[PDB]
Symmetry: D2
């Protein structure tokens, strides 16, 4: 089939829950990013054949958020758009989906990625329409229900991390060390300017003030192992998982311009990387965190690669426990994993995370002259997704 | 480029607003349709590569409704699933998306379709999380907001219909005649058993009983022109659009098994039709209903067909005004359109409609010397999608 | 010490939950009752010194519901109004409060009574103002919370009834016989016209019609012991209390004009009865239903009367269990109690009940050689109030 | 009739909206105050015959808030309690109501006053019980609807202040000067310890911390006339009323122990003051602010006093405009009005305000050796209430 490339890859900074981006709707984050990704790719809005964006907390956002972001970004109305929901994997899945549409021969240029604003998720009244009749009811946290709660087992994603901790025998201490290393790498990457190429600033203008947001705010600078060790278990009594060793609730948008190699050549675009392969897989939801094992395996096999051939690795850090389990089984060289930091420090804006880690991977591969790169993440409901890139 | 075929095409009865399916979650309707579609295809669940389902009012449904439908159908958990939101076109787009993935070489068997339960849509409190602070606020109807309201023009889909009516000068009388023809064809189709093959009964587990739902309930048997003429305009004072000539709010699921011709020959599947081509298009959101014009023209062009050559046509009746305009412009033979009734009579469960009309198309084609078929529909946000089918 | 009399006593029909009065706000019911009570007293609105009305579910009713009732009745705005909340006893306490103010020398004419519309009670979001932050929360049923739940013991009023049943060993069978006697007396009373004098018809303004409500609708005509024996316990597994032997949720307004005997002689008013004495008492909230025992004993003591001397008794039937216990302890002649049915049959609109039973008492007294009457009721929170009447 | 006295008068500090007392329910404020008022009066809880407390935003507070405060304060369950709602006048009305019950001969010692927590008022869904059916609805601010919105004219209390400003021709400049003087007197009274006798501290203990609240937080220290003059109109375009010249949204509880003079003598209590007279009056709701004119007039006439005989005056400052109108018509000596400051600086916790200003008056009369004192306030819905005290 046609060769498929990434022409540009941009993301907004990742905001903290109810913090810096609390006033900026996901679709506005998405438009900011699309607009910058088009410019960076050096193509006209007119060259785009489709918009495919991830978004998980769609409640009250209005019809087709992806279509909304496309408009607000200045893209012509002629361009079709859809919104994808593969939970945590939505942002990454849109990129492989774009590669597939291109391969099928139906498009040359597709805007892919994801967007999410966890801070602005509504609460819900499920029986308002026909009435509650009598008795107290649940006022629902839509962010937990739609993005973080297992539909089948009736418990938080955090409990699937505990399940992995027990089954793979991953201690609280191990988990804390992993979390601390994530913090340290993020602080260094941030203070040394490693995300400057990737981040597109967000301008929020109020009745009087204008405020620019361009720095990832989730990371806790000067984190310590004693700091992590004092934390209480977040999800269960005597649990190993904490706020410290698990990723947070976050707001972000990350977008990539995807093109066929021939069309890039035509338009004078220098590609950042080729998409070599990808895959998705399902697992028992109670161990959803291990989804990347099978997705990474499938993708690597198709590629003809070996894990040891990989130069850089982005494995999303939803929970220390699942990332450790996955990293051990796949036999990762930890030195090549999440070099600029991971979700424990940077955050987890669900619909956009899979796109976020691929945007981070591509730019790191550029700056480090790394040739082969993997991006993979686990997905609530027991799924996994992955992509392999080879630098141009 | 592999040929893509439809192995089976199933749907539940279409429930009316707050009625027969009001207690059946969308994911359960999807699960019922999925189970029956796999059986009708005569395949093994473990040959299914992916589940791709349409669903628009995802609010409070939990993580990955497509995934829930898959799991509650008893499909193996190894199979990945994703939810698609393209509003009205979602159920049809999953089918074209499935063809694209097979054409890309990444799968041989995919479950596509859509599901929707409008009766169960919640209400939202958008500022519940960080507070309303002071002052009255909106208790939001999520069904309207995410399904039926334009995000850009801030008005109901009905006004997009009034816009086409005004622009094309389509009279109330014309609209009413079209609605009557839809109601007549639907009543005849239901009474003579035309939907018997396509519909999968839904069993509802009562407190100390069981009830079966297997009949479309939206149609108003015995509709008359005089009774339609008496209706007051629905969306605008002195408008032409009414409850009578516009589709309703409905609950349904429609699923199809999609396969490569090659895998179908290997499993000895007897395909219902070949997917010859497809298309999506974006238009001014203000005239969203005219989306099928460009989407249909694109697909037909790819096919090398003409409107003349079509034997059966399914054009969704979101509104009589937009259906009339599309039909006049595309020059359809009305005798070939919506032969068993359309959405004015049958209903419009948004996530599932694009799939529902494909189901209805393929089954109508099996009962006639109908070689060529077209399925097309308009999409809130200013889009259109279409598929062309050829009987096997 | 001036003598205090009742000049008139009126009430609306008692509506059942979500039925006939569901569209009539409590303040409108109050306004209807106020208007008729003033006319029946034959006084001029400008001789009224104060409005004092019972109302418990005030949530969202707007400022000063008593004031709204007064204004919508067409009473002069110069008249002050206040709303009283003593739960179940509110409507009766306004009457005693009125006697106290007249006895103090501060007024000659006061409108007293109560109003309630349980069908219209809202639901609440208690943390909407400053935010829920995260997590599912309760969507609160205000009717239950403000009207039927104990603030101290955290359980339903029904459990206070089970507590009395267990403590006094009042059997389900006893409770059921009492409920049947209430239903029988109510059916006979309604059919033979006993409530014709007391009830003021409520006119409801439909979309293109008018409907009149003038008949109590809670009673179940044709009630049988077998049908009551078959009911499942309402509040406790294996409990004695059921929907059958406990009162319902209802809508009503009951108003009385109260005057000094001296002002009545000056305006030539022919009084229905003299208020001889009254009492309120507090008890353990866990046995709230026994409040009438102490309240009745106190009032009787002040009067210099005995239970023997009473000719007619109105003891509110919030629950058969508590009515039985109060009656046994006070040694009532059951033939003299609730002669036209009680609240098991007629209903329990909380704000208005204490007033309703006074209305019913005075009108029953006018039809018999009933010289001495007692009105008493139990109050959630562990209280009782009582009034003693003597015919004029 | 019997002579009636105030034995003790305590209040919590007044908290600012969503500030210092946001975590302390009204009933808890009320209990803190009752407990201190009993101690200060030098009587046992056992000597109290009834609890009568004002509270306006009762929504979701559970049955009989007054009964709840009485319990939480340690008062025996035998003591009856009720909650009064006369809007702004509720707190003051309970005191005169107590005087009347005592005069009627039914009690010797009554706990009177009011309580309110505006910060904790819920939001409401009025059609949750039977359903909204379809369409956006209002998520209601219960604090505005129940305490600050005119039921009849459909506008904020602020608009009734504007109405007074226009009719009496009170300028924005006049209003600002009045507001500035209120701020200045409050700051001086606070910094000089004038409220030390009256305030009972509130201890809030969290999971870890304990925080004491004992200082009125509403006042803006160092206020200036330029500060006031820059403020925008709060309620209408080109309006005279601002946030600066109108009182705020506040939390407080104020309680008084009321006794007959004979019972005080019996128990060895030294009274703070005698209640000489009181009255309530109704006005056109559109000019509710002028209610104190007629209530003050009635009370003074009964007393046999003259305005010039008054030594101290507490006229509640809901709006500068209404207080100026009232003060002009009643010909007040401004030097004797709100000496320690008024509601513009101190706040307006509705159910408790009328009690708050009487607690302030009594203590000031003590410290200043003032002999005659007036307390009066306007009431939403067009009412007014007043009391006259003579020092013991």
């Amino acid at each position: 089939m046609k060769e498929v490339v990434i022409a540009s890859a941009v993301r907004t900074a990742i905001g903290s829950y109810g913090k810096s981006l609390k006033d900026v709707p996901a679709v506005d984050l998405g438009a900011t990013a699309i607009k910058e990704a088009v410019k960076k790719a050096g193509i006209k809005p007119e060259d785009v054949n489709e918009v495919i964006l991830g978004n998980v907390l769609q409640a009250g956002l209005g019809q087709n958020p992806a279509r909304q972001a496309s408009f607000k970004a200045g893209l012509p109305q002629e361009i079709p758009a859809m919104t994808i929901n593969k939970v945590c994997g939505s942002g990454l899945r849109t990129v492989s989906l774009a590669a597939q549409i291109i391969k099928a021969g139906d498009a040359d240029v597709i805007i892919a990625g994801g967007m999410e604003n966890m801070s602005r998720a509504p609460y819900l009244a499920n029986n308002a329409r026909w009435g509650y009749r009598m008795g107290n009811a649940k006022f629902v946290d839509e962010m937990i229900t739609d993005g973080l709660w297992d539909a089948f087992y009736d418990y938080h994603m955090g409990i699937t991390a505990e399940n992995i901790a027990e089954r793979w025998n991953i201690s609280r201490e191990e988990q804390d060390e992993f979390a601390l290393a994530s913090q340290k790498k993020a602080e260094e990457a941030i203070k040394s300017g490693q995300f400057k190429d990737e981040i597109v600033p967000v301008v929020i203008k109020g009745r009087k003030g204008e405020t620019v947001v361009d720095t990832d705010e989730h990371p806790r600078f000067g984190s310590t192992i004693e700091g992590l060790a004092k934390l209480k278990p977040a999800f269960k009594k005597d649990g190993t998982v904490t706020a410290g060793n698990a990723s947070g609730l976050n707001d972000c948008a990350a977008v990539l311009v995807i093109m066929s190699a021939e069309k890039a050549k035509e338009l004078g675009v220098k590609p950042l990387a080729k998409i070599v392969s990808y895959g998705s897989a399902g697992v028992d939801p109670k161990i959803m965190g291990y989804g990347p094992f099978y997705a990474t395996k499938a993708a690597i096999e198709k590629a003809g690669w070996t894990v040891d051939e990989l130069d850089l690795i982005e494995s999303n850090e939803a929970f220390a426990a699942q990332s450790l389990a996955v990293a051990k089984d796949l036999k990762f060289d930890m030195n090549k994993v999440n070099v600029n930091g991971g979700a424990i420090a940077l955050g987890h804006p669900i619909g956009a995370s899979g796109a976020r880690i691929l945007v981070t991977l591509v730019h790191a591969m550029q700056k480090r002259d790394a040739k082969k790169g993997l991006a993979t993440l686990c997905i609530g409901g027991g799924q996994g997704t992955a992509i392999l890139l080879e630098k141009c």
